[PDB]
């Protein structure tokens, strides 16, 4: 079976993650399940059920990709807490929190390529900005 370079899991409380993917696909085209997945921790769901769904999404992406980047909505959220505890020392799994559309788009566009992740992250930070201030 194919082992691609890099899978992406986008995870959040609520609908942030699936909505981000939907929007990203408007720019980069439809993705498939062996490369990109989302997971939302919904109102009324507990972290016990969520936890193993999460673990399963990352494990399954690793069957098809050499590495996985987990994008989470914010630091100290449950998706981020779970990701860090479950995959703390697994070097093939990266965790970037506070993601925006520019990060997600760039990671999808480059997932069959070599990347510099620090540079991608740095550019995604710089993509969040006050537009009148910056355009003068």
């Amino acid at each position: 079976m194919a082992s691609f370079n890099r899978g992406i899991l986008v995870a959040s409380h609520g609908n942030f993650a699936s909505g981000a993917l939907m929007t990203a696909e408007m720019f980069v085209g439809e993705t498939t399940n062996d490369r990109v997945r989302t997971l939302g921790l919904m109102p009324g769901e507990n972290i016990v059920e969520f936890e193993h769904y999460f673990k399963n999404q990352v494990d399954e992406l690793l069957d098809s990709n050499q590495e996985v980047i987990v994008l989470t909505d914010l630091i100290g959220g449950s998706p981020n807490n779970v990701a860090l505890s479950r995959f703390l020392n697994l070097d093939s799994v990266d965790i970037v929190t506070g993601f925006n559309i520019p990060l997600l788009v760039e990671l999808i566009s480059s997932y069959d390529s070599k990347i510099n992740l620090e540079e991608i992250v740095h550019n995604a930070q710089n993509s969040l900005f006050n537009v009148k201030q910056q355009l003068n």
Copy 2:
């Protein structure tokens, strides 16, 4: 009628905007239409219809708030293009692009308060980060 401090319009291609609000409300509680709105430019919709929906959302928020912050998904997207052209020199309307959940949450939490927007933006940039790198 009440003029509050600050309204928020969250705008994007697709479902990014509504999904971001839904998620933000999991942290800060349910919002109402006179303070916070979303708008998505959907597949199959043109910028001609979208444009005036957009204008109308900002105008109506200004009936109830002294200022409005428009959050858009990315620079050079149609929501951002429209916002900048329509409200270029209206000082009561700010435009911050590349938004993430930390920005949206903070702006909702502080919308009845005096703010330092530069500081909020700077902190939102710093909220997007590689968590293993930063936690060492």
